[PDB]
Amino acid sequence: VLPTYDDVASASERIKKFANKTPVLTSSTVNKEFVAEVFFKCENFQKMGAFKFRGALNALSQLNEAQRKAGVLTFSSGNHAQAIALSAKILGIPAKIIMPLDAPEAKVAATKGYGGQVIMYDRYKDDREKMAKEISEREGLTIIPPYDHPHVLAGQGTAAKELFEEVGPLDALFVCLGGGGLLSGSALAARHFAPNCEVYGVEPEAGNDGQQSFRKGSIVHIDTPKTIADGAQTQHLGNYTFSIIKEKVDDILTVSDEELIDCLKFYAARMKIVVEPTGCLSFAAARAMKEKLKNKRIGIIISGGNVDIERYAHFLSQ
Amino acid sequence: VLPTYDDVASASERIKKFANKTPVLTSSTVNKEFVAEVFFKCENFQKMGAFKFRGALNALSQLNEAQRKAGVLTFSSGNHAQAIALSAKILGIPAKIIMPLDAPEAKVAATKGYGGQVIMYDRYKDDREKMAKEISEREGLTIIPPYDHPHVLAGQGTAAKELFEEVGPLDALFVCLGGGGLLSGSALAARHFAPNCEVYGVEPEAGNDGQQSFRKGSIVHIDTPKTIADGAQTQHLGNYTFSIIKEKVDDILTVSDEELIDCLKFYAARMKIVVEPTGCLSFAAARAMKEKLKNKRIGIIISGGNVDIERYAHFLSQ
Ligand SMILES: Nc1ncnc2c1ncn2[C@@H]1O[C@H](COP(=O)(O)OP(=O)(O)CP(=O)(O)O)[C@@H](O)[C@H]1O
Ligand SMILES: Nc1ncnc2c1ncn2[C@@H]1O[C@H](COP(=O)(O)OP(=O)(O)CP(=O)(O)O)[C@@H](O)[C@H]1O
Ligand SMILES: *Cc1c(COP(=O)(O)O)cnc(C)c1O
Ligand SMILES: *Cc1c(COP(=O)(O)O)cnc(C)c1O
Ligand SMILES: [Mg+2]
Ligand SMILES: [Mg+2]
Ligand SMILES: [Mg+2]
Ligand SMILES: [Mg+2]
């Protein structure tokens, strides 16, 4: 019913031949600011540009021959789509990707570069799911959840696992929260390598459905939030994700878009790395409570760096 | 409080030096199908490509010197934006246009070609209104409603006025319904030239907030509908529009996207004209009740032809 550190440890072994052991970056500037030692696990450097490659590969690596021969299909507007496209190509599995007619050029080219078969639909009529069900059932294609799947969350969790192995136990771990895949998997690693670690999920304040769920004790749904963290606009947590979250997550924090923008610029000018808006949640939340992190070892996950260069330029000049 | 045919008649005089007297097209094929005579007022041929030029010009032509010197601002994702841009340029009024970072190239080029000063914002964070209020108040800019304004609806109404003048009284008139500007103004012309005319507004079935309002007797709001009629995705009717609608509109009809697509292809292959999805509502509704239109004279308004060539190609091949 629920994955454990073991699955994360196995996922590590299962994806080792293809995943990147992303670097852990450090900033003397950040440390002085926090009066502590901060560690950044940079998944923006992961294959495809986001941690998602982990969960996607782990899940696809566990499909049977019939499914692998038939292929998979994805319709997510987020990083999961290219995570699936690239993993599928790596594993010799055909992949169909449903994208909006006006999808960013770079993302479309990336997807075709990964061998994905692009099927387009009109954004104004978001009947993606309808199309996905019709197509996947008619062609016997498999659809891997972007977060609410035991194999997917175990894979995402391998990023946290690697962090600790390189740096060691931690007092706190800040992780981006959308559907909960990264959050749940990261919790499994944390509780193992450093049982005395405060684990925080972070959501854009305009969409704290996760926070309400955490407090309510049951999954709460909300209208799609208006925020620049395009990768964290989910409307509700997943069953498998929330279960692990309510039992291993200490608390869900929220940050404003203004803070995300400040973090995005800091990463670029001060750390020289490109990070997408959603990937700034964890750092923003951490900075907000730095006064409470004196002389501790903090971990910050940078979920990804796939930001349309135009939006990136736009935010950098804000 | 409410405009009358008179305002429509004056609007006609007020915009005459710049608006196009769009043609009325006829199809023997459509007539045989309906066992009647059908008349198409083609506003896709209007300046800027949509009827909106009428209401925009009429409204801007009535601003005082201080406002004209200060300029206007628009943030609509629909045809109203370019209607304002072009009208403002024609009248020597500066215009600032708020558009999404990923707005279609052609629309952006059209807007700059009309002398509009483009200000972009991130689509994922739709804080347009916030920005519009801050900017318009700080620079003393005027914002003309896309439909809920007496001057705007009177202008839109001039299209219906011209139809009757060229063809004569009608038993029925089918008009696209979004916010109600075109619907209300058209009602004023109809009741004048042909008091015995059935006037129908038409909305995409997925967003019949107008229909519910018409039945409820009071404006009903709804979540943005998923439909290809991008120009009719409004969430509620306007005060001035609904008032005229409840008193001069016989009934609000709805059609499916499938029907819109069929009409779009018919216009292209059978009538050789380019029409945007939203501009197909009225024709679709009419075809659906053609059995009830035998030996009558029907009027059909084609609201516009501004469809991204990519979506157009996509729909044509559906
Ligand atoms: N054809 C294309 N056009 C534009 N962007 C592309 C692209 N193909 C890939 N990308 C993007 O460029 C980056 C490429 O990452 P990718 O992870 O596939 O390999 P690399 O070549 O960087 C891997 P490695 O460092 O692990 O050897 C990603 O952020 C991806 O979204
Ligand atoms: N630079 C540009 N790039 C792409 N499309 C443009 C454009 N400038 C205008 N358009 C579009 O092309 C069409 C141009 O209409 P416009 O009404 O301004 O003049 P015309 O040159 O067709 C007027 P007229 O026939 O009344 O003399 C519209 O549908 C508009 O949206
Ligand atoms: C998918 C994604 C997230 C959210 O992860 P979940 O497992 O849905 O909570 C955060 N940041 C980026 C860059 C993502 O692609
Ligand atoms: C704006 C628009 C409509 C809707 O008109 P309203 O006055 O909002 O009801 C319909 N079709 C097109 C092409 C439009 O641009
Ligand atoms: Mg790389
Ligand atoms: Mg949320
Ligand atoms: Mg023309
Ligand atoms: Mg409606």
Following DSSP, what letter does each residue of B148-187 receive, concatenated?
SSHHHHHHHHHHHHHHHHHH---SEEEEE-SSSHHHHHHH
Query: Which DSSP helix (H) or strand (E) runs through B191?
Result: helix B181-193
Q: Mark yes or no for CB contact A125/B233 under 8 Å.
A: no
| Residues B275 and B157 both lie in one domain | yes
Strands B24-25, B37-42: pairing is antiparallel
- 10 Å CB burial of residue A140 (0-12, 13-18, 19+) is exposed
From A147, A166, A193, the end of a domain falls on: A147
Amino acid, single-letter form, for residue A303:
S
| Residues A6 and A59 both lie in one domain | no
> Is A52 among the catalytic positions?
yes
Distance CA B4, CA B188 (A): 6
Q: Whose CA is nearest to atom 24 of ligand 1?
A: A47
Is residue B87 part of an annotated ligand binding site? Answer: no
For residues A200 and A287, the answer to whether their CB atoms sit within 8 Å is: no
- 3-state SS assignment for residue A310: helix
Structure tokens at A113: 């570069």
Sheet holding A198-204, edge to edge: A24-25, A37-42, A297-302, A172-176, A198-204, A251-255
Distance CA A25, CA A42 (A): 7
- 10 Å CB burial of residue A217 (0-12, 13-18, 19+) is exposed
Following DSSP, what letter does each residue of B247-301 receive, concatenated?
HH--EEEEE-HHHHHHHHHHHHHHH-----GGGGHHHHHHHHTGGGGTT-EEEEE
Distance CA A301, CA A160 (A): 8
- Which residues form ligand 2's pocket by a CB distance below 6 Å? B 20, 47-49, 82, 106, 109-110, 113, 306
The CATH number for A131's domain is 3.40.50.1100
Closest-CA residue of chain A to B229: A124
Way the structure was solved: X-ray
Determine the residue among A77, A108, A124 to mutate to test chain B binding: the one whose Cβ has the most chain B Cβ atoms within 10 Å. Answer: A124
Distance CA A214, CA A178 (A): 13
Q: Mark yes or no for CB contact A127/B226 under 8 Å.
A: yes
Task: Specify the ligand 3 atom closest to the Cα of A183.
Answer: 9
Question: Which chain A residues are Cβ-neighbours of B315 within 8 angstroms?
Answer: 122
Report how far ligand 6's centroid is from the alpha carbon of A212 (Å): 9
Q: Mark yes or no for CB contact A127/B228 under 8 Å.
A: no
Closest-CA residue of chain A to B309: A101
| Residues A100 and A183 both lie in one domain | no
| Residues A1 and A71 both lie in one domain | no
| Residues B280 and B207 both lie in one domain | yes
Report how far ligand 3's centroid is from the alpha carbon of A81 (Å): 12
| Residues B72 and B9 both lie in one domain | no
Report how far ligand 8's centroid is from the alpha carbon of B287 (Å): 20
Q: Whose CA is nearest to atom 14 of ligand 1?
A: A48
Distance CA B303, CA B282 (A): 9
Structure letter (DSSP) for residue A69: H
Which ligand lies nearest to the CA atom of residue B20 in the structure? Answer: 2
| Residues B253 and B218 both lie in one domain | yes
Task: Specify the ligand 4 atom closest to the Cα of B180.
Answer: 9
Report, in angstroms and rounded to the nearest whole number, the Rg of chain A calculated over CA atoms.
18
Which ligand lies nearest to the CA atom of residue A21 in the structure? Answer: 1
From A147, A170, A198, the end of a domain falls on: A147
| Residues A170 and A66 both lie in one domain | no
Following DSSP, what letter does each residue of A9-29 receive, concatenated?
HHHHHHHTTTS----EE--HH
Resolution (A): 1.9
Residues in A whose CB is inside 8 Å of some CB of B read 101-102, 104, 120, 122, 124-127, 223, 226-230, 233, 257, 308, 310-311, 314-315
From the list A124, A223, A226, the residue facing B125 with the nearest CB is A226
Cross-strand pairs, B50: B304
Angle between helical axes of A105-113 and A79-90 (0-180°, round to 10): 20
Report how far ligand 8's centroid is from the alpha carbon of B202 (Å): 8
Q: How many domains does one find in chain B? A: 2
CA distances (Å), A260 to each of A23, A201, A277, B181, in order?
22, 15, 6, 40
φ/ψ of residue B31, rounded to 5: -60, -45
Residues whose CB falls within 8 Å of the CB of residue A69, separated by 6 or more in sequence, listed in order: none
| Residues A14 and A162 both lie in one domain | yes
- 3-state SS assignment for residue A119: strand
Tokens 């995705």: give the residue: B233
Query: Which residue among A41, A52, A96, A107 is the active-site one?
Result: A52
From A112, A147, A182, the end of a domain falls on: A147
Distance CA A200, CA A180 (A): 12
Query: Which residue among B12, B61, B76, B77 is the active-site one?
Result: B77
The range of the structural domain enclosing residue A242 comes to 1-50+148-318
- 10 Å CB burial of residue B21 (0-12, 13-18, 19+) is middle
Q: How long, in residues, is chain B?
A: 318
CB atoms within 10 A of CB B255: 24
Report, in angstroms and rounded to the nearest whole number, the Rg of chain B calculated over CA atoms.
18
Distance CA B314, CA B318 (A): 6
From the list A120, A125, A227, the residue facing B227 with the nearest CB is A125
Is residue B246 part of an annotated ligand binding site? Answer: no
> Is B246 among the catalytic positions?
no
Q: Mark yes or no for CB contact A311/B101 under 8 Å.
A: yes
Question: Which chain A residues are Cβ-neighbours of B126 within 8 angstroms?
Answer: 226
Report how far ligand 7's centroid is from the alpha carbon of B21 (Å): 11
| Residues A15 and A39 both lie in one domain | yes
| Residues B283 and B236 both lie in one domain | yes
Question: Which chain A residues are Cβ-neighbours of B125 within 8 angstroms?
Answer: 226-228, 257
From the list B122, B127, B229, the residue facing A311 with the nearest CB is B122
Query: Which residue among B41, B52, B96, B161 is the active-site one?
Result: B52
| Residues A209 and A129 both lie in one domain | no
Task: Specify the ligand 1 atom closest to the Cα of A49.
Answer: 29
Q: Which one of A43, A48, A276 would you pick to mutate in the ligand 1 pocket, going by the greatest count of ligand atoms within 8 A of its CB?
A: A48
From the list A122, A126, A314, the residue facing B122 with the nearest CB is A314
Query: Which residue among A61, A76, A77, A186 is the active-site one?
Result: A77
